[model samples]
Target: GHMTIPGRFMTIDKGTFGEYTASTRWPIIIQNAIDDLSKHQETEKSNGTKFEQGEVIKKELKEFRQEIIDRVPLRPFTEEEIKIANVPLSFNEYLKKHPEVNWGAVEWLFSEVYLYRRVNVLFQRQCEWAKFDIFNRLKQSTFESSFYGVVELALRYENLLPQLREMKQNDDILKVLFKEFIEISLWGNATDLSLLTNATLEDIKSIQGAKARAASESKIVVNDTEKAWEVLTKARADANSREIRVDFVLDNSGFELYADLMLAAFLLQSGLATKCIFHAKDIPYMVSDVMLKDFDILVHDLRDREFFPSGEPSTKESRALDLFAGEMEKFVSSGKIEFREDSFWTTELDYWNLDANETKYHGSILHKDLQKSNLVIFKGDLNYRKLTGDRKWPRTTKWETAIGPLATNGITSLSLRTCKADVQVALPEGLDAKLSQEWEKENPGRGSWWCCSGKWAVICFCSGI
Candidate 1:
């Protein structure tokens, strides 16, 4: 149904090249689901009215967990799944073409989306819990763990932003800061708990400081921000330019979002763009991806110091927290920043459908809207996979070619991704072997595409993709 070739795409088979798809990653995701929902039961019961309907959700989630462990056949999505804006039909059509596959046997990308959707159906089935996010507690807890990074970057923003005011007049200085902020957004992908199992509070801190970030460049195996800067510079250089819309296809709602907003604030402050648009998910996703509600929660959390529960921070933390939050509130009030969510983000469609022929689908609609923007920054691993159809292409394949329809269609895009899946493209010759040799010294049992390691990153840009 979705024009995917069989056997070529990455699947959750017991293959030698990648154990992540099944043995490690899948079980952790399922366990996280079970753990989060189990915690919800206690909280729901304490709320009294919530448990009246929440009990049904709790039971369904447990059964969902059991089905995963038991390798149950993936039946077509039913009524509750159909109720979500565009989920049912996409998933039903997806399943219709592959009746033989089951939970563990299906393609990795397919099963992963199904796993999240099935968890969502539990909430949808109940009237009272329909709008509840079972993953909300975990998301908040993780961000709270990253409160230090929040305060650290906030302080950095306070010092750096004043300088960007003069950056429009100084092209040389502007380029340096623009590169720095984009890198901030790129490494934010590594801090994701959904992807990094040991993304401890301290683990996220490794990317925050000027010292940490300056050293991170060597890790970006592919970089195209120089070209991205070219696009933004032209937009800024033209005084008659229309409002330069820089959109973010967002991921991970924790401290990573703070970095994204920091980048946005700098762009607006520096006259790089007139306004910003953020496309967030409509529901709980992958444990860490931002939904509209996460943005709402983040706003309130940053405002309320009580959000950081590991005791009071030093006075410096107080000023940074309120200072950053205040500036963000100003951006919202003055209309410099705006957020929108589409059901299409959570759909089963790959981004290859983002063009005229696939206009009936969501990505095509987004394609039309983004065509007007100066740059649309697609964030993180999942979006990267979706962009390239999650296929295991040659390491040297051009990223533009790897991305298929988006290669020459759609508008300009800068994909800021940290490689976490097997499918990678546009590398220097023998880079995979170079990394492979290094990995032999680093850790012996590694695939040619040792992507899930979390150390490597790429910033690939496409002009009018």
Candidate 2:
């Protein structure tokens, strides 16, 4: 079981307060406020009068808060419930017992506990229910960033679309593109946020499992140039003869779901795929990813244009969203996207045993269909962690190799993720060590913590036979 009192305490503390503001559904509200503020500022700039943009922002925030209340039922902990939950005792006892967990840990524990307790107040009443996200938005943010990264990649690689359209059976060039796409999909998990800003291209390359220990202890970053070219070629090749079947193991909602939709649209529009299946979690998931009902709600909101604009709506973000929205509309109209809701496509399944009859019965039904497709893209952190079994393998393990049983049947798979947790693979030699040393010297206690950063990404490809 992945439960330690310390680990549990850390998880709650970090999730509740440290990343709470960022994850609390507040950013979306703030983003809407900023957008409205900007619009108001523009009007004032032209008219030369201070038009109460601040007031509008405040009002929107209030409404946004109410909306959250509507969605999440907030509740306060009764003294008895608190006593049974033993949250306070956990922290106090840990400090009293260890007395040497480092000042940073202690400080983090108190702050996180305090924030968790305070924020829990929002759930005390039925009115505040809509606002109670215990995971603090980290899951949501990770999903958004991963979605954005894919969109950025698609736009950057847009030229491939025309090539794909012109692809014919047995085309050498198409093979190359397929390879590139597979690589992107595979290494997606390597982009954990904890490792970004400091990871290098060479480091990413040396992450073959056996070499990963050394690599993790070294300083290397996997460069995208050659890998990108290879992936593009493979994608083109795969699309030459028949349509690609794409399965998206989904995570998160709102903008992040929009991003996944955008990628699906690109695959279809580019002629790289003919059918797309989205496998959704059946149970109440790890906070974000779409549950069965979330899909309908998202569609309703989008069709009605009720979604809060994701960010400041920079020219780039707006254009990307619009272009993607248009493509999505076409996809829906054309009926290429399909959704499958299942309880087994969940965190409880053993990722490494994906090929076992029992495991397949549990959740690998999706993987069976995935084998028929050109590629399977697993989205977000939890899925990625599950894909790799959350094992402490050396960073250099080739993704296919690390995936163990999932690779047995030869499924072409890719993972698109922004690193949020500790699992990682595919690194270049010496890169990991260098980063660890530098991070230790600079940030001391937080050394090697960069492995979890969301700034970096890896594109891995598993060639199923």
Candidate 3:
């Protein structure tokens, strides 16, 4: 647990964002779980066992919420929990080492992950609901609401395709395209369901448009896109080298996943990389994280007219979406795009564990695998949290220092993350204070709290090579 940088990790009791997540955010998530299951139970009333099982899961979720409110002490998983969830081997030891740690006051990353892991057990316990994603409805509904954003990007890609092909030989244009697609993927994270718990269709749509992205350009506090461009360009220049492969450690599903796919396709189309591999979670994660299942659902949803249900059934936008999905399908079928998962992603381990020396952890293998990548884009806030160990690093800490061994691990990484969590790094000296004052003036009563607002972003990179 202490293998990360020598600093205190953010804790629910001590960190404002963590406190809000544990108190306000998590309860809403849990209630959503209860509601989803109750709705399922009602709809499936003909299946007596399924309905009964849903009732049990709903009741258990209520108890789970109460435990958080009561600040219950950490405990070893029950036999059923272990059997159903395949409880991580280190969990019992973690509990033993911190006997007094509780739901409300423990390390933010660890406890938040544990909450989801435990909740998954509720579904896993019953065969009828073993593969049911309680959050699937929320995930899909959120994506469907991103109709305008989806259509916009689809058309944008269609417009860019011919231009990319015509200008493939022009490094200057390719570089610009690289930056544009990366930024699109970066800001696509703004609609994260976990962060925007109360967001309306209008709110989600507002953030996904081209105008919002253009307005937010100056908000990227740490931009290393040029460095990433250099890596891709260097690989392109090396004819003797193995085919360039970019790995995406994916984040939320729906529109974010769509944005990521666009970036991946751009990399392949622009000859920046010959292959794009997506590493996804094996289990439902962090409310909206991509599982392999979600990948299929997204590609399918893109072609479904009623799925988006916005404009005419066969408008230019809809046709563009169909073409986009078809291209994605071809990429996957041709092995240009691939999907993979590791149990390590869903575990409570911070990325400090993603070290070659950490042989006891599964991340050692993932670490080695990433070394083969030309670029590894870790998308969204949760990945950023794990990368930096969710610590309260001073705002001015170097990006390399914040990520510990990852800085030197030879993985050539980039983080396209919108600021949504407590941990932030690589800000210029005093910019955090300036932004804090600026934010407080505009919003009032929330000084020193700009990082969690999702209004800002960081495109941090490390040339591990």
Candidate 4:
């Protein structure tokens, strides 16, 4: 029954059964925050007055970790919470319900939001450390690490867009290309079984494109991208081929975002859409998620050398990547692409509040704004959870049924995500059991833990047109 404890969704508490909320994710998340700060301090190796500030940050961070392990009650927010939509009200209401509410003792979703914001407080208070991102090093390194995928994609698209102008006249040509770009955008999500691991540009170039996509085919659990293609293409036709704007509520910052931009460039180049708008987090979030700055940062890394220098000075890999950045930059320059950020995206409210109940919240406006788009692609795990109310619906529930009011509110939606938590919906009979059998057949001891590992994905879409 969906009316009991964790009725619709898993509660964020110590007693939840998953390894996610109940056992390890909290400590892992906290430890990583502490460690990222330590690395930034040690690696910078500065000896100036700012060095003293880093030391203080680390000390306070350690204390913050202690508060979690000790299960202490969350303190009331500083004045910072006032501008953050509804955080204080929610926090106060939770605290009122459980006067003894402690870190490990609160709901998982709220506690996680509180934990990140609480850490944000540690820096926001320090005059010298106000805007420093401790996770900056890690995000950049991961992007550079995917140099192989980056260059491979760039090579495939080198001068392809200019050529696509003469080509889209053939519906057959654009039809196949359309499907390819949709898959590219879908796979831009965070997960893989074995491909792209330790892959080099030479290794990637050697594989057949069909084989590469075919090799990764089994990992995708649900695919409804055709619904998306139909909406986008038909909308443009309905407009008599006028501009059909598309918006992306972006996810991770590194390679995944790179893929998203590449997909956007293709849509523009192919005449499928007129303009593109991307929405990114206004502040630091979930470590790998995109900030408004990541887009430009990626272009720089791609345009310049030193990101993936083999020290050969003029390698083909560097040249391919440079060309890739050039294509993406054109969209930015022509005003065909732009990024928007809102403090609300950085707040603690879940997306289920998109309707009027939370009229005072930012998402109400976001919902209305999205209604203007031909399609809106919501990305990754957190966004997926929010879309579905993060509820524990039975596995086979319909896609529209899981999303509440957004299902029928008139904005075509696609959620490209890899399962990373306990909340999931729209599975067929025996699919999970079949997945379990496959997971443990080759590897014993761990039974079907592939979802959180990001080895599996689902391309879920619901038309609001």
Q: Rate the local accuracy (lDDT) of all candidates.
A: 0.74, 0.50, 0.81, 0.70
- What digit string (tens of lDDT, one per residue) describes model 3 on residues 408-457? 88888999999998778899988998998998897676666698888889
Candidate 1 Cα outliers beyond 4 Å, as residue runs: 1-8, 14-19, 44-49, 84-86, 189-214, 309-314
* Higher-scoring candidate on lDDT, 1 or 2: 1
Q: Summing lDDT over every window of 10 consecutive residues in candidate 2, give the lowest-scoring window.
A: 3-12
Question: Using alpha carbons, what is the TM-score of model 4?
Answer: 0.87
Worst 10 residues of 4 by lDDT: 193-202
**Between candidates 1 and 2, the TM-score winner:** 1
The CA lDDT at 194 in model 3 is: 29
Q: What TM-score, computed on C-alpha atoms, does each candidate reach?
A: 0.89, 0.53, 0.91, 0.87
Error of 1 at 2 (Å): 12
Alpha carbon lDDT at 4, candidate 2: 21
Sorting all predicted structures by TM-score, with the top scorer first, yields: 3, 1, 4, 2
Name the candidate that leads on TM-score: 3
- Measured on C-alpha atoms, candidate 3 has an lDDT of 0.81
lDDT of 1 at 414: 90
The number of the candidate with the highest lDDT is 3
